Scaffold this active site. Sequence first.
Site, PDB file in Angstrom:
ATOM      1  N   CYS A  70      41.874   3.314  -1.130  1.00  0.00           N
ATOM      2  CA  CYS A  70      41.486   4.209  -2.213  1.00  0.00           C
ATOM      3  C   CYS A  70      40.080   3.915  -2.718  1.00  0.00           C
ATOM      4  O   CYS A  70      39.322   4.840  -3.016  1.00  0.00           O
ATOM      5  CB  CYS A  70      42.489   4.100  -3.356  1.00  0.00           C
ATOM      6  SG  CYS A  70      44.053   4.852  -2.931  1.00  0.00           S
ATOM      7  N   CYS A 116      43.237   0.316  -4.398  1.00  0.00           N
ATOM      8  CA  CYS A 116      43.400  -0.553  -3.238  1.00  0.00           C
ATOM      9  C   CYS A 116      42.198  -0.396  -2.303  1.00  0.00           C
ATOM     10  O   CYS A 116      41.300   0.420  -2.538  1.00  0.00           O
ATOM     11  CB  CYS A 116      44.724  -0.224  -2.552  1.00  0.00           C
ATOM     12  SG  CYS A 116      44.640   1.221  -1.495  1.00  0.00           S
ATOM     13  N   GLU A 175      45.028   8.114  -5.961  1.00  0.00           N
ATOM     14  CA  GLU A 175      43.584   8.334  -6.001  1.00  0.00           C
ATOM     15  C   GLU A 175      43.123   9.227  -4.850  1.00  0.00           C
ATOM     16  O   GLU A 175      42.315  10.141  -5.050  1.00  0.00           O
ATOM     17  CB  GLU A 175      42.841   6.994  -5.986  1.00  0.00           C
ATOM     18  CG  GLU A 175      43.248   6.043  -7.112  1.00  0.00           C
ATOM     19  CD  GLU A 175      44.407   5.132  -6.733  1.00  0.00           C
ATOM     20  OE1 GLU A 175      45.505   5.647  -6.426  1.00  0.00           O
ATOM     21  OE2 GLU A 175      44.221   3.896  -6.749  1.00  0.00           O
ATOM     22  N   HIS A 229      48.002   8.050  -1.453  1.00  0.00           N
ATOM     23  CA  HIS A 229      47.997   7.390  -2.747  1.00  0.00           C
ATOM     24  C   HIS A 229      47.522   8.362  -3.819  1.00  0.00           C
ATOM     25  O   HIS A 229      46.962   9.425  -3.528  1.00  0.00           O
ATOM     26  CB  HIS A 229      47.093   6.156  -2.737  1.00  0.00           C
ATOM     27  CG  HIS A 229      47.683   4.975  -2.034  1.00  0.00           C
ATOM     28  ND1 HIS A 229      47.148   3.708  -2.130  1.00  0.00           N
ATOM     29  CD2 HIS A 229      48.754   4.870  -1.213  1.00  0.00           C
ATOM     30  CE1 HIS A 229      47.871   2.872  -1.407  1.00  0.00           C
ATOM     31  NE2 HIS A 229      48.853   3.551  -0.843  1.00  0.00           N
TER      32      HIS A 229
HETATM   33  O1  LIG Z   1      49.235   5.639  -5.225  1.00  0.00           O
HETATM   34  C1  LIG Z   1      48.983   4.193  -5.177  1.00  0.00           C
HETATM   35  N1  LIG Z   1      47.921   3.941  -5.948  1.00  0.00           N
HETATM   36  C2  LIG Z   1      47.490   2.667  -6.077  1.00  0.00           C
HETATM   37  N2  LIG Z   1      48.100   1.649  -5.414  1.00  0.00           N
HETATM   38  C3  LIG Z   1      49.171   1.917  -4.624  1.00  0.00           C
HETATM   39  C4  LIG Z   1      49.620   3.167  -4.502  1.00  0.00           C
HETATM   40  N3  LIG Z   1      50.700   3.164  -3.663  1.00  0.00           N
HETATM   41  C5  LIG Z   1      50.922   1.927  -3.272  1.00  0.00           C
HETATM   42  N4  LIG Z   1      49.984   1.155  -3.888  1.00  0.00           N
HETATM   43  C6  LIG Z   1      49.909  -0.286  -3.636  1.00  0.00           C
HETATM   44  O2  LIG Z   1      49.905  -0.999  -4.855  1.00  0.00           O
HETATM   45  C7  LIG Z   1      49.200  -2.260  -4.657  1.00  0.00           C
HETATM   46  C8  LIG Z   1      48.182  -2.443  -5.757  1.00  0.00           C
HETATM   47  O3  LIG Z   1      46.940  -1.825  -5.429  1.00  0.00           O
HETATM   48  C9  LIG Z   1      48.621  -2.205  -3.236  1.00  0.00           C
HETATM   49  O4  LIG Z   1      49.507  -2.867  -2.333  1.00  0.00           O
HETATM   50  C10 LIG Z   1      48.628  -0.712  -2.934  1.00  0.00           C
HETATM   51  O5  LIG Z   1      48.636  -0.382  -1.563  1.00  0.00           O
HETATM   52 ZN   LIG Z   2      45.300   3.094  -2.798  1.00  0.00          ZN
END
Ligand SMILES: O=c1[nH]cnc2c1ncn2[C@@H]1O[C@H](CO)[C@@H](O)[C@H]1O
Ligand SMILES: [Zn+2]
Lengths: 157, 157
Positions: free
Chosen positions: A85, A82, A54, A52
């Site tokens: 993260c 999430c 973060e 992700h």
């Molecule tokens: O890079 C990312 N950063 C933040 N949330 C993400 C990312 N990729 C997927 N999600 C998804 O977006 C939703 C909201 O938090 C969660 O399902 C998370 O896993």
């Molecule tokens: Zn995340």
Amino acid sequence: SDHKFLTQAVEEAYKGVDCGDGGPFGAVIVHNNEVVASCHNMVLKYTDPTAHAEVTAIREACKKLNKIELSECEIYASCEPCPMCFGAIHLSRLKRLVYGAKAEAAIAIGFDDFIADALRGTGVYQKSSLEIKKADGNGAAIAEQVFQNTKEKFRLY
Amino acid sequence: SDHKFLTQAVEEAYKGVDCGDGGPFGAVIVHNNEVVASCHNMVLKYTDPTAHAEVTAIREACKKLNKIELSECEIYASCEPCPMCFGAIHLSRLKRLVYGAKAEAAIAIGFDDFIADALRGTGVYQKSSLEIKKADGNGAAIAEQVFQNTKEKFRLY
Ligand SMILES: O=c1[nH]cnc2c1ncn2[C@@H]1O[C@H](CO)[C@@H](O)[C@H]1O
Ligand SMILES: [Zn+2]
Ligand SMILES: O=c1[nH]cnc2c1ncn2[C@@H]1O[C@H](CO)[C@@H](O)[C@H]1O
Ligand SMILES: [Zn+2]
């Protein structure tokens, strides 16, 4: 200054969707007014579901600063972090988190209903202590607009 | 079958603290009887506080299988996954988790009181449908003893 770095995180979200790197998410880690890391979701590029925005920013900031703790730094997340993260943010000892869009804005376009209790104040076994600011006004506006502007321009994961 | 892979994760924990790679934590990802990845905590080696054993194993397994989902695979963790690691396990679509030691055995030797609400079922927002097995008997005892056996042979983080 909060708005500047949150805007750069939203920019990373757009950049990553344009690159094909992953989903519309960005994160900027700053040592005061110095950007130490500027990243977006790299799940598709890296074949790594943990990459992700973060988590990627934390890895890069720790490499940049040559330390495993970021107590001097703050993190700006285009989207509410999430559970994974926010766990990483806890472990990294970042002293402040500023996020732009509520998790519901990303969930509305098909990402998992996957919300960090410890961030929202409903954690029991995970005790958060860092400063947390949810964006309002224009920051919330641009962060939420990310998901309408990027709709159907990336593969969900 | 569970006992073999749990004990392999414990062996990884010992090997990792002996190498100085990180803390006494190991993780093994298997596709039925086939080991896809076998890893330990790499936080010190990588200068990366997200490089817990479970996250490292997820990264390596996904790279090995060329996919970001692990729905045919299960993960064995020498210690109860933390909020970061449990979130990563959720995002990787791993179908089952087996862990050996409860988090308290790690907290006992100084690690943070940092426990995943979703694993223990204490969350408002985050709820898990993942099949979770806490080991019993011999595997459990072997796993819990790692922390008292490794007390001050590593740098805490
Ligand atoms: O890079 C990312 N950063 C933040 N949330 C993400 C990312 N990729 C997927 N999600 C998804 O977006 C939703 C909201 O938090 C969660 O399902 C998370 O896993
Ligand atoms: Zn995340
Ligand atoms: O590689 C690791 N795997 C699992 N837990 C770890 C690891 N490194 C540090 N901890 C820490 O051990 C405690 C109990 O789970 C938690 O504080 C967690 O962050
Ligand atoms: Zn962990």
